[PDB]
């Protein structure tokens, strides 16, 4: 019985608390989207907007929890970009081996980092360890794959550049998300093995049923999403 616009007014404060905590660029994108919902003629149009908010806000909060930079989708580097700038001596070979699979060059993960525009991180192993720790401590489904030429050992007398590819998400089928993600990147990982490039792929996901202390985002951010974007989804259906 409530019009979509009136739904947005009742949730004015929860959504103000949301926009205040998200990173700037992320906060603006959700704000634009929110006014699209408020001015949404249809329930279909509103629903797609709400979904995009759910994903954008969650990723902003994932950036905050890990102190990583939130990158709007438009600015996110592709795999080819990372290879070209981070491993320039191998980019030509990278092209030849992606002739039969050129979509590899256009793979765009949520986070594309390298060891200290590809973002930088102080240690890739530390990031993998904390994912592996919480997965083991709380039972949270992850998938994780490292490139490895032949059966090469790690070495102590030299340092090599390396990539960390990360995929995140806020959807109800958590196992389905990490399974599909790792399957998408498997060919790439195997490609990187044959080029001698060291990469790690991580993938994880939360849904609203996950206990508020066990998410990949801080619990304070869990309450912000549950109080705003998830209530909005409930209002949109019951009206």
């Amino acid at each position, epitope marked *: 019985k409530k019009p979509i616009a009136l739904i947005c007014a009742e949730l004015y404060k929860p959504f103000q608390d949301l926009f205040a905590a998200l990173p700037k660029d992320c906060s603006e994108e959700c704000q634009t989207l929110f006014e699209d919902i408020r001015n949404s003629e249809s329930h279909a149009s509103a629903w797609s907007s709400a979904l995009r908010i759910k994903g954008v806000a969650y990723e902003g909060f994932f950036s905050l929890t890990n102190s990583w930079r939130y990158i709007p989708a438009d600015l996110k580097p592709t795999l080819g970009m990372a290879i070209q700038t981070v491993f320039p001596d191998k980019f030509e070979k990278f092209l030849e081996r992606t002739h039969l699979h050129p979509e590899y060059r256009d793979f765009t993960p949520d986070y594309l980092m390298c060891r200290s525009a590809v973002q930088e991180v102080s240690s890739v192993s530390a990031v993998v360890d904390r994912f592996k720790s919480k997965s083991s401590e709380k039972g949270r489904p992850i998938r994780q794959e490292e490139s490895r030429p032949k*059966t*090469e*050992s*790690m*070495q*102590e*007398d*030299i340092e*090599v550049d390396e990539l960390l590819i990360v995929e995140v998400g806020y959807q109800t089928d958590i196992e389905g998300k990490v399974i599909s993600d790792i399957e998408k990147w498997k060919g790439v990982v195997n490609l990187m093995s044959h080029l001698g490039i060291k990469v790690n792929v991580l993938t994880c996901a939360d849904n609203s049923q996950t206990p508020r202390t066990d998410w990949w985002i801080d619990e304070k951010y869990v309450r912000l999403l549950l109080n705003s974007i998830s209530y909005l989804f409930k209002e949109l259906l019951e009206n």
Partner: antibody
Amino acid sequence: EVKLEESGGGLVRPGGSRKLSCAASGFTFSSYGMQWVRQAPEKGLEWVAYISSGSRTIYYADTVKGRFTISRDNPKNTLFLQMTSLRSEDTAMYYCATGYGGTWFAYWGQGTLVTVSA
Amino acid sequence: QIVLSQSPLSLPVSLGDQASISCRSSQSLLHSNGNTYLHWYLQKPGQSPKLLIYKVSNRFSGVPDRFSGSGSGTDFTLKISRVEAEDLGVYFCSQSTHVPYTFGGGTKLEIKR
């Protein structure tokens, strides 16, 4: 002077268990990977296990997998090898080694003799 | 696993002569990071092994300079330019490019008399 001093050897019954230790001195132990190597009497060298400085990476010979655990206590400058379900084929002199900067065996201990027999 | 084939199995040599020991790898030991992790060890009778040469041709600190190594890919050699009594023992090659790290079976250096 870099020194590695193994202890823990002796006689064990087949199927039994044993824990080797290696006390390291003369270098910053916690910054370097550590290794175990063994030599059966009258035979050649055989690599056993490696462990990185921070313990994140561990490798095993296929013949000890599922039976041997390598570990370390960096504040105590000690490397360990926990041996279980031992067989007569595990009878050997056991050496701890380190590359002090690489994965080669630059520094070796005097070794400790493990005998698996009833 | 990398199989390392050493020849000859045993090497009789006169004091003062040179000696060459060959180590053949079943696969290339060139690691993707650019280094080649092939090393040489002497084990004297009764003692623990001693490193001689690391990454193909670097003499370990303190090792007498009559010892040297060369090679690339799957073919590598240890030379003792002038053999001395103390060089009696077994020489092993080993790689650490791939897991498992592996050793050759050992060449016994024998002093000719």
